[PDB]
Design a protein around this nucleic acid. Structure first.
Ligand SMILES: [Mg+2]
Lengths: 452, 414
RNA sequence: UGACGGCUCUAAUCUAUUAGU
DNA sequence: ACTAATAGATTAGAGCCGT
């Protein structure tokens, strides 16, 4: 008989330091941790796209009721949740003609096609960014379906990458999402039906817009102080690999500071997805210096986690550049071995937060499960748990589980209950997808506002 | 004294608005009694307050809250109470329904000016908060303590996790028994053409130049010419109990490599016996499924849970892929699959078509549906009552529990 | 690319071992 | 040293549907 220890759900801080377990409830009830004065929109689309965007903004002004209000919380309205104003009439609209898109699409070179499609939008924003006095906080790109389907060296990745040197928060919204009712797959019904999940769509879009405009919808507090939770992701370039780092740590006031710590890092090694000693030393020195400048003193622990296992050489380099009094914990999080738990009698999956301890150096954690708070399980099918292995260093296998579960609750790109994989890894993955989309960038923007 | 703000509404529909507003007002230091917030004769308790406890009577007005006679009763008493209080600024309507024309209300309220919530709730709450200070309604400090209690009693006490014990059926099938000892035979020279072990009927792997196998040196004689004449007393034999304990560490072979060879032998034996068993196989990208076919299953079903099926034009077949993992405890990790066949006789040769079906078919099946199918499909493998054996040698073999490992958890949900 | 999740198909590396160059 | 084979492992990706 195998015993499953249980890890409870951590609490995330909201306005006035009040705690809750669901962003979709904590925000609607309490309000964001930091409030902004308002959001100046910026739209780069057609007249059709501008009309759609204004319609959607005014629609989310009013409360949004989704079909199953009980399982997924309703949307009070943008100003009702966040406390700032987001009007559809303050749009600094920059028109894009379908004809110039058409002449771009007719070019033989696909790489030049996607480069020119990116260049159109970015140069119009670049131009507006420097030639418009009206300040714009977030630029919302209402792209048509032709861009999405004809152009497939990715539109989104390069577009986010080529704006990094100018530091312009952007939000791509395909017109299929905003006008889903009038986008039908010739059957007479929408291509993807948002009807029962309209409120959750409003939640996600509004949260993304609020975050990119300088607001912090919620922050984390159920993590150990003095520890720099650091995540690495390796991305393929074809025979090079690129490593990206995202770090989250409590400050002097115990407030989470989540920032990327990524410079271009390329390793040529026979072993896949590893790092030469120089790159590893540079990465750890950057992270430690960032913690030092944010808090003064050095961390009491460097909780390095990744989807891969570290070899000896890079760990020795890590230790060599590490000062004294600081411990290093290298944790590998893998999601490949199928351990599907079926409940004996019933029809709803295992509760999220259950944890199976293999031994002192490994565990299974169900970061995806059935959450009673929303009554809606995060997985349609049986949820595969994440295998958390303490690869190197000394740690408490339950403390690592609770730390990972806490790190699974800071996804600002979506206002879901919690993320299946820890957020630092997923955001480092997004950075790697973007930082590698364009050529190596000097001092790349270190804030997720410019990536997600 | 009367320091409570009564909130009246439709019971099954206006809950969302009133819950937000009541919690919003409570968070600001007010004392708000709402039936959704504090209901537990019902007319008598609310009347007491309306005539004694209520200081304001906020009407969540909508196209249904004005057709709810129960609600109209609550206004009828409010109005009177208003006359007892001479408080003309008592009933303060709250119109959230943009569908409501604002000018289709009962005479009692049609003469009173609403607070507009039709266009956005935030300005309406700003309007309400504006009115409440204007009418000097007293309010306590917005302490998030007693207010926190109401918040949890409403939503954060619901977060509660049933602390009863549940039983979870996984997909790990432990290996009941491993052979007494591991044997390293030497057929390097006896090998007629150093051929692979496809001819061998017993799982064998040539570690270095020694064909190690759980089959005895004499077992290979039919498919192995020259090897037929092999002398004994020249076979490296390692205790499998020592290997699994990770105790055998010799320069000839390490524990890691020996366990690797054990895993490989188990995988081969499963593939072998699979052929012994009546079931068609499927070539997946990186595994071998077993697409059950018509004839091998009565009514395309077994152990009371189908393992086969038929789609709109194709046929779904519940298949499984086995990979034995000694870590943590020797188990035969089994994975569920669905193979769609053109007519239950031949699998579609299009991976994209097969995948798109697996997906659509996956919507129908549930937790219990997958568990029953997996357990029934495994129970077909059973040779004896409570297990099934996978030969690892003519004399030695590996037995695997036909029931998966049970996992028991501390907590459950509703 | 509002999102999340499951799955499917490729691909390489690592390690061991033998063969050959 | 360097290629080929058989694995098992460990990681990438590309993809395609569901909600
Ligand atoms: Mg985003």
């Amino acid at each position: 008989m195998k015993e499953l220890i249980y890890i409870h759900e951590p609490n995330i801080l909201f306005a006035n330091g009040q705690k809750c377990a669901d962003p979709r409830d904590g925000l609607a009830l309490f309000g964001p941790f930091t409030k902004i004065y308002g959001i100046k929109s910026g739209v780069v689309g057609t007249q059709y796209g501008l009309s759609i965007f204004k319609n959607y903004i005014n629609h989310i002004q009013k409360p949004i009721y989704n079909a199953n209000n009980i399982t997924r919380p309703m949307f009070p309205g943008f100003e009702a949740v966040f406390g700032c104003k987001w009007d559809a009439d303050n749009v600094v609209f920059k028109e894009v003609t379908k004809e110039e898109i058409e002449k771009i699409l007719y070019t033989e070179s696909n790489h030049k096609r996607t480069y020119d499609l990116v260049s159109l939008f970015i140069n119009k924003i670049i131009t507006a960014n420097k030639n418009e006095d009206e300040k714009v906080d977030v630029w919302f790109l209402v792209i048509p379906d032709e861009i999405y389907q004809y152009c497939r060296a990715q539109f989104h990745d390069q577009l986010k990458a080529r704006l990094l040197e100018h530091t312009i928060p952007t939000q791509i919204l395909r017109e299929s999402t905003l006008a889903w009712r009038d986008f039908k797959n010739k059957f007479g019904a929408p291509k993807r039906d948002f009807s029962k999940i309209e409120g959750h769509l409003a939640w996600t879009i509004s949260t993304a817009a609020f975050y990119k405009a300088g607001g912090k919808p919620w922050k984390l507090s159920d993590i150990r102080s003095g520890v720099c939770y650091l995540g690495l992701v390796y991305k393929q370039i074809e025979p090079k690999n690129a490593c990206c780092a995202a770090q989250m740590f409590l400050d002097n006031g115990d407030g989470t500071v989540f920032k990327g710590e990524v410079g271009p890092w390329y390793n040529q090694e026979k072993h896949e997805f590893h790092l030469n000693p120089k790159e590893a030393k540079a990465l750890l020195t950057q992270a430690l210096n960032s913690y030092k400048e944010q808090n003064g003193v050095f961390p009491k622990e460097i909780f390095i986690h990744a989807k891969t296992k570290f070899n000896g050489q890079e760990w020795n380099a890590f230790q060599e550049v590490t000062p004294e009094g600081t411990n290093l914990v290298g944790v590998t999080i893998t999601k490949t071995k199928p351990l599907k738990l079926f409940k004996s009698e019933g029809n709803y999956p295992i509760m999220r937060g259950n944890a199976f301890i293999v031994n002192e150096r490994s565990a299974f954690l169900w970061t995806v499960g059935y959450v009673p708070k929303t009554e809606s399980t995060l997985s349609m099918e049986v949820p595969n748990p994440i295998f958390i292995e303490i690869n190197k260093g000394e740690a408490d296998i339950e403390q690592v589980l609770k730390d990972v579960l806490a790190l699974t609750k800071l996804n600002y790109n979506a206002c879901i209950y919690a993320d299946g994989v820890p957020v630092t890894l997923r955001f480092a993955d997004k950075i790697g997808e973007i930082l590698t989309a364009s050529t190596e960038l000097k001092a790349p923007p270190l804030a997720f506002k410019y990536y997600i | 004294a009367r320091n409570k703000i009564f909130i009246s509404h439709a019971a099954p529909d206006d809950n969302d608005f009133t819950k937000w507003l009541a919690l919003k007002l409570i968070a600001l230091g007010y004392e708000v009694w709402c039936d959704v917030l504090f209901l537990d004769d019902f007319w008598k308790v609310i009347d007491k307050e309306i005539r004694e406890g209520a200081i304001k009577f906020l009407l969540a007005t909508s196209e249904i809250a004005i057709k709810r006679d129960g609600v109209l009763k609550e206004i009828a008493v409010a109005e009177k109470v208003k006359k007892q209080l001479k408080d003309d600024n008592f009933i303060i309507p709250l119109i959230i329904d943009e569908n409501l024309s604002y000018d289709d209300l009962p005479p009692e309220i049609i003469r009173l000016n609403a607070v507009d919530f039709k266009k956005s709730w935030a300005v309406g709450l700003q309007d309400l908060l504006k009115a409440l200070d204007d009418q000097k309604v007293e309010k306590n400090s917005p302490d998030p303590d007693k207010s926190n209690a109401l918040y949890q009693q409403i939503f954060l006490h619901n977060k509660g996790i049933i602390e009863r014990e549940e039983i979870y059926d996984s997909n790990w099938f432990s290996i009941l028994s491993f052979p007494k000892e591991l044997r390293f035979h030497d057929y390097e020279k006896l090998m007629p053409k150093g051929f692979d072990v496809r001819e061998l009927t017993y799982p064998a792997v040539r570690y270095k130049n020694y064909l190690c196998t759980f089959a005895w040196e004499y077992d290979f004689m039919h498919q192995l010419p020259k090897t037929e004449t092999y002398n004994s007393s020249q076979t490296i034999r390692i205790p499998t109990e020592e290997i699994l304990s990770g105790k055998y560490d010799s320069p000839f072979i390490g524990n890691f490599e020996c366990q690797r060879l054990i895993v490989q032998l188990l995988n081969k034996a499963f593939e072998l016996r699979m052929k012994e068993k009546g079931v068609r196989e499927y070539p997946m990208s990186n595994k071998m499924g077993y697409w059950f076919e018509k004839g091998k299953l009565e009514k395309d079903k077994f152990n009371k849970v189908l393992l086969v099926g038929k789609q709109k034009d194709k046929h779904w077949h519940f298949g499984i892929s086995a990979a034995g993992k000694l870590y943590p405890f020797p188990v035969l990790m089994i994975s569920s699959h669905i193979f769609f066949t053109k007519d239950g006789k031949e699998l579609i040769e299009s991976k994209k078509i097969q995948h798109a079906a697996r997906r659509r078919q996956g919507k129908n099946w549930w937790n219990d549906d997958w568990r029953n199918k997996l357990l029934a499909f495994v129970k077909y493998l059973s040779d004896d009552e409570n297990s099934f054996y996978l030969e690892v040698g003519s004399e030695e073999k590996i037995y695997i529990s036909n029931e998966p490992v049970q996992f028991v958890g501390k907590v459950s949900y509703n």
